[PDB]
Design a protein around this ligand. Structure first.
Ligand SMILES: Nc1ncnc2c1ncn2[C@@H]1O[C@H](COP(=O)(O)OP(=O)(O)OP(=O)(O)O)[C@@H](O)[C@H]1O
Ligand SMILES: [Mg+2]
Ligand SMILES: [Mg+2]
Lengths: 147, 985, 76, 75
């Protein structure tokens, strides 16, 4: 696991992710702290979201545990930071890199999926009153994702 | 009336009906040697109605080679008489008897008849009777490293289950007018051509819901066909399908008929020409015994071998067998005629016991009809095996010396093994080692470790433990039992109660491991397997891995510098459901059981832990306010469980349980339906509650309903346990308390600054001070499935069934709920016996020090279908480093405790490689991209000092080495893999 | 060429292959028909475990040959 | 030519296509008409699932053939 994790880290260092920056916490290779920038064409524009990534002892044969640490008002992210992503629960394979996961999370942020929601109330607000959802998302990203 | 406290693991393999039929079947066993006693033990543990033994032959010393119920004080006593008393203790529900004489008509009292150590004429005489009276007949034989099984269940055997798999079920998406059934998105039905299915809940085609099975024509992994459904309708939508398993009729031939034209079962496809040879060889053995007053050929005797081969020629000519006899193999069968190995006995006994259970239950596919097996690759080649070394010495190991010799006996007697785990496989392994004489020499020793204690359910397949041993440590009991079996092991066994893992390296350290000869795993989880595999790889010790699951099993061997390790291959992972499915949209009972388990943890475990930690840690609040993802939840839990909702009697517990019922089965559903009404549609215009999403309906509490009352009782009892109150079970108090309950009004909420922190502070300071409460603690509930009086499984079952009623899912019972929630692994005694036999057959290969990789076999088997297969181990991969051949697995660098700069310089000058990353454990000691100041600080330090500084933990005094992982690049910049580094402290 | 694969659970699978196909192609076909990733498949023919990077003709696998698809178990 | 695509709810969509048209183009037409992303469209004909990168002629789709459209939902 150590060699794979270091290879991914070096690959990140070589070619910058531009919109993301993940690295080990202190000197522990199995605990990373990543950062994601809110897409410009989204309610979360101009926001910095911190994620915690926990590689299991069996990596890459078990998915990393990725949790948001910043509060976000999204139909697919709940108060614990859990992310409704298929590739993190049962579709995980030992061929996906952390950069792919970060790109998937950014794409999820750019457009939510209210048809299979994790937070039914936010999904209902999104489906019925879109403008209120936009205002709430902007308020939350200004209150938590900036500073 | 099956005692589920004992047959818990076996019922998950067989079932209630199968065991009900088993409990009414009688088994007769002729022969009480190692094979016979193994079969009888497995049958008694299985749970047949009764067992009868017939063996009037007086005991002899050599019989102790594989008979573990015989002692040296029983010489001259009939074997059955001395074995019945010890067999009667294995299971209290299975009487064991002895008959001094056998008459043909007496056979009519038995459901199954097993025959061992009997001549062919007697077998023909018995089978001529059993066949025409419809009695299952099994005949087993074990000669040295060769074995044979024959089954004859009658001309009209009815098999109800042919593979032992659960019926397949699936969710449909659409059924066209031509019967083309399509599965949901990316879902496989798993059917085969010729299967039968029945449909339910199909809309648009009500005619398919009657329940008549229909033929299945598989057209792809996602679709199949059922025929023409023109009349029933035009097109069907949604619904579910379930496979229907139909009985089969199997016709067996009598032994007399099948001798001429046998039907073979092949345990190995690599040698398909052998079973025809063994068929002649075993008959020749019987003829030779008949011609010499029942005496088999003497060990490694050439005259007897020649006469035996003459008999083989005669038999082959008589039967018009157009097969060329392999002289070497047949004479090998002759040489080992008097062999009696405990490993072969265990293997064949497990197989034959499974066949007996098939006969008595009409389940699983039986052997049809001849099963000839050999493990001739285990014959030693590093020692002298001749007539002089194989002659008997008048000791209990004669049956083994007749195959391996005295020099190999000396080799076995000085082994130093290490057995990890003392479960079913551990007990079988200890028995096999005791019988084989392992570690009975001056320099021998056995070490066994296991941190668990004996429980009632373990007695069903761990025959070394008795009911009086419940509550004691497994390792001590196993060591004492095997010291009773073989007295020479007194003082040669050491038992530890230590878990093998990173925390026990102070006991199983360098000194402990350097003295071993091999390691044998008997574990039940993959983490321990991987850890022990890594330790064996580091210390370069042979490893024997084995595993079982229901009727399936496998065994693998890891040999230093020859094969790959256990961790070089990948296994399928456990399936975990998406959080969105469990939280809101379940459609299977497994989802509701997982939800109920999470609810149990969140109601009776987490709040109690938070309250207790608040009353112990002086700085708990501040740490929680910035550590947890929801400090508000922690504060609310503490407040509710300390002041707001602290019960003073059991009536308040009942009221709390009623409130929780409302919270989790009536109000959350109302909120969910407020967010997504049943008539809502998706963004594409499709209905929202279609397919995998089922529309729920709120539950209204009714005291008379059984599930509601069960939930109330279990929740109130668990809450009282948390607060230490006196619970009750009389329905009168529950009905009286719940009558006067006024539900608070509830209305779903439509929704519509920094003061929240002030509110959190106000809540925090409102809590009573820890000083005011000293010595006060709340007892958390620790999940325990094996106790049927703590209400854990009762609560989980009630919650799961209530949530199933919410979403219109078919509820399950306590049996299936315990199976799913407890992560129980089905277990059988027969599979354990087979795997132990295979492992002990590989152990002799390891002891002999075989070098070629084609001489070892990894084994896989499924007894439900009678499948056995073997394959050579995979050789360890090689690589080129600096123009040198390096083993990717078993090679390492040995360096002194130098500085980091010196290590880098050594790798640059010696291997011509540039070090880019260096890590130890879970820490990054050095990386090429670190800032220059940090490196300049870390460069002149020794590796031990660097590890201590980075990990912030001093190395223990017992630590004698460090393992480092290094990634380096060549001169051109291409990354080259290198083996790990072993720094000697 | 047509070959058969028998699973440890009793299922049978029919594959249409050629003698020149690599073991990787066979594993991919088995994944298509069963969903088992190639890295988790253990194929046995005539007492030899098939390894990636080689061809069928290396193992003398001819038409109507029977392979066994096996797996390890964690109990015990 | 013309073809018909039936959905899980009983709706029928008529499409004007050619035997040489790729599956991707047909999925693009279905996305333009119904708004369903191609990645979530699962088209089935005669018990076989249509795969991207191929053409209708590869599946022997002819005049006025009938397909079935189901949808997979991202988790
Ligand atoms: N890391 C470990 N170190 C030492 N012994 C272990 C370890 N993990 C498991 N064991 C032991 O291995 C044995 C596993 O055998 P088995 O699974 O048949 O027993 P069990 O877990 O007690 O029973 P059951 O699974 O039927 O409830 C048990 O003795 C267990 O204590
Ligand atoms: Mg236990
Ligand atoms: Mg266990």
């Amino acid at each position: 696991a150590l060699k794979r994790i270091n290879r991914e880290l070096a690959d990140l260092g070589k070619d910058p992710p531009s919109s993301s920056s993940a690295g080990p916490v202190g000197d522990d290779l199995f605990h990373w702290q990543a950062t994601i920038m809110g897409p410009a064409d989204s309610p979360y524009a101009g926001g910095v979201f911190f994620l915690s990534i926990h590689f299991p002892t069996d990596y890459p044969f078990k998915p990393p545990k990725v949790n948001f640490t910043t509060r976000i008002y999204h139909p697919n992210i709940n108060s614990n930071g859990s992310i409704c992503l298929d590739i993190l629960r049962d579709q995980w394979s030992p061929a996906l890199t952390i950069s792919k996961v970060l790109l998937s999370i950014s794409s999820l942020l750019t457009d939510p999926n209210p048809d299979d929601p994790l937070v039914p109330e936010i999904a209902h607000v999104y489906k019925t009153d879109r403008s209120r959802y936009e205002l709430s998302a902007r308020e939350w990203t200004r209150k938590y994702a900036i500073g | 009336t099956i005692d589920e406290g004992l047959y818990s693991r076996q019922l998950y393999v067989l079932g209630h009906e199968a065991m009900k039929q088993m409990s009414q079947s009688n088994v007769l066993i002729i022969g009480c040697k190692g094979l016979g006693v193994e079969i009888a033990k497995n049958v008694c543990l299985a749970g047949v109605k009764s067992v009868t033994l017939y063996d009037p032959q007086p005991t002899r010393i050599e019989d102790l080679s594989s008979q573990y119920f015989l002692t040296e004080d029983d010489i001259g006593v009939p074997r059955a008489k001395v074995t019945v008393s010890k067999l009667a203790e294995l299971n209290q529900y299975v009487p064991v008897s002895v008959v001094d004489e056998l008459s043909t008509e007496y056979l009519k009292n038995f459901k199954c008849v097993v025959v061992t150590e009997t001549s062919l004429t007697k077998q023909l005489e018995i089978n001529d009777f059993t066949h025409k009276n419809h009695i299952a007949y099994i005949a087993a034989d074990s000669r040295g490293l060769f074995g044979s099984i024959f089954c004859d269940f009658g001309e009209n055997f009815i098999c109800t289950d042919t593979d032992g798999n659960e019926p397949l079920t699936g969710m449909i998406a659409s059924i066209t007018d031509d019967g083309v059934v399509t599965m949901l998105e990316e879902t496989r039905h798993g059917l085969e051509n010729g299967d039968f299915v029945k449909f339910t809940e199909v809309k648009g085609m009500p005619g398919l819901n009657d329940g008549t099975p229909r033929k299945v024509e598989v057209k792809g992994p996602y679709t199949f066909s059922i025929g023409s459904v023109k009349d029933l309708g035009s097109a069907g939508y949604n619904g579910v399908f379930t496979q229907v398993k139909v009985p089969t009729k199997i016709s067996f031939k009598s032994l007399r008929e099948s001798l001429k034209d046998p039907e073979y079962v092949y345990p190995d496809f690599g040698k398909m020409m052998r079973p025809p040879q063994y068929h002649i060889a075993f008959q020749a053995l019987s003829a030779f015994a008949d011609a010499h007053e029942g005496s088999l050929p003497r060990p490694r005797n050439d005259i007897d071998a020649a006469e035996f081969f003459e008999f083989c020629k005669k038999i082959a000519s008589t039967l018009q067998f157009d097969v060329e006899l392999d002289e070497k193999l047949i004479k090998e069968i002759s040489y080992q005629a008097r062999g009696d190995l405990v490993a072969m006995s265990a293997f064949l006994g497990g197989a034959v016991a499974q066949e007996v259970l098939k006969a008595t239950t009409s389940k699983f596919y039986p052997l049809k009809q001849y099963f000839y097996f050999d493990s001739l690759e285990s014959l030693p080649s590093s020692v002298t095996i001749s007539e002089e070394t194989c002659k008997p010495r008048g000791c209990r190991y004669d049956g083994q010396i007749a195959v391996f010799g005295s020099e190999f006996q000396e080799k076995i007697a000085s082994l130093s093994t290490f057995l990890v785990g003392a479960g079913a496989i551990g007990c079988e392994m200890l028995k096999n080692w005791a019988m084989m004489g392992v570690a009975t020499g001056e320099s021998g020793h056995i070490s066994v470790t296991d941190m668990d204690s004996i429980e009632k359910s373990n007695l069903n397949r761990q025959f070394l433990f008795r009911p009086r041993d419940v509550g004691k440590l497994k390792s001590e009991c196993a060591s004492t039992a095997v010291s009773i079996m073989n007295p020479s092991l007194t003082g040669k066994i050491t038992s530890y109660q230590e878990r093998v893992g990173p925390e026990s390296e102070g006991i199983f350290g360098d000194e402990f491991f350097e003295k071993l000869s091999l390691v044998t795993n008997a574990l039940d989880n993959v983490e321990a397997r991987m850890y022990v595999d890594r330790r064996c790889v580091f210390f370069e010790k042979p490893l024997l891995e084995s595993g079982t699951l229901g009727t399936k099993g496998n065994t693998q061997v890891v040999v230093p510098h020859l094969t790959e390790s256990y961790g070089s291959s990948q296994d399928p992972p456990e399936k975990s459901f998406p959080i969105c499915t469990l939280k809101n949209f379940p459609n299977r009972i497994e989802h509701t059981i997982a939800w109920a388990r999470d609810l149990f943890e969140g109601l009776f475990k987490q709040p109690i832990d938070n309250v207790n930690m608040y009353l112990s840690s002086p700085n708990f609040l501040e740490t929680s306010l910035k550590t947890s993802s929801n400090p508000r939840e922690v504060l609310e839990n503490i407040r509710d469980y300390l002041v707001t909702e602290k019960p003073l009697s059991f009536e308040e517990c009942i009221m709390w349980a009623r409130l929780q019922f409302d919270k989790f089965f009536n109000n959350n559903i109302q909120q969910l339906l407020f967010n997504f009404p049943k008539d809502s549609v998706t963004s594409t215009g499709q209905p929202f509650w279609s397919g995998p999403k089922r529309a729920p309906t709120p539950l209204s509490f009714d005291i008379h309903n059984r599930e509601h009352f069960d939930f109330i009782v279990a929740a109130a009892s668990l809450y009282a346990f948390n607060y230490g109150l006196k619970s009750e079970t009389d329905p009168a108090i529950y009905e009286r308390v719940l009558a006067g309950y006024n539900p608070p009004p509830f209305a779903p909420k439509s929704g519509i600054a920094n003061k929240d922190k002030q509110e959190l502070k106000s809540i925090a300071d409102s809590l009573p001070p820890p000083s005011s409460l000293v010595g006060f603690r709340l007892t958390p509930a620790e999940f325990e499935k094996d106790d049927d009086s703590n209400h854990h499984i009762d609560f989980i079952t009630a919650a799961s069934n209530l949530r199933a009623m919410n979403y219109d899912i078919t509820p399950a019972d306590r049996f299936k709920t315990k199976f799913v929630a407890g992560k129980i692994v089905p277990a059988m005694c027969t599979s354990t016996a087979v795997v132990s036999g295979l492992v002990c057959l590989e152990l002799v290969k390891l002891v002999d020090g075989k070098k070629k990789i084609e001489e070892y076999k990894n084994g896989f088997f499924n007894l439900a279908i009678g499948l056995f297969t073997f394959s050579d181990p995979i050789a360890s991969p090689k690589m080129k480093v600096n123009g040198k051949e390096i083993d990717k697995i078993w090679d390492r660098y040995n360096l002194p405790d130098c500085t980091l700069q010196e290590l880098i310089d050594y790798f640059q000058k010696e291997e011509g490689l540039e070090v880019t990353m260096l890590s130890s454990g879970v820490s990054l000691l050095y990386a090429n991209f670190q800032p220059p100041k940090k490196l300049a600080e870390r460069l002149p330090l020794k590796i031990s000092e660097l590890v201590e500084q980075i990990t912030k933990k001093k190395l223990e005094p017992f630590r004698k080495h460090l393992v480092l992982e290094i990634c380096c690049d060549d001169a051109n910049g291409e990354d080259v893999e290198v083996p790990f580094i072993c720094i000697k402290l | 060429m047509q070959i058969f694969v028998k699973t440890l659970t009793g299922k049978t699978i029919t594959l249409e292959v050629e003698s020149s196909d690599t073991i990787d192609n066979v594993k991919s076909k088995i994944q298509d028909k069963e969903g088992i990733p190639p890295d988790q498949q253990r194929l046995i023919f005539a007492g030899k475990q098939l390894e990636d990077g080689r061809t069928l003709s290396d193992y003398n696998i001819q038409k109507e040959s029977t392979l066994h698809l096996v797996l390890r178990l964690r109990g015990g």
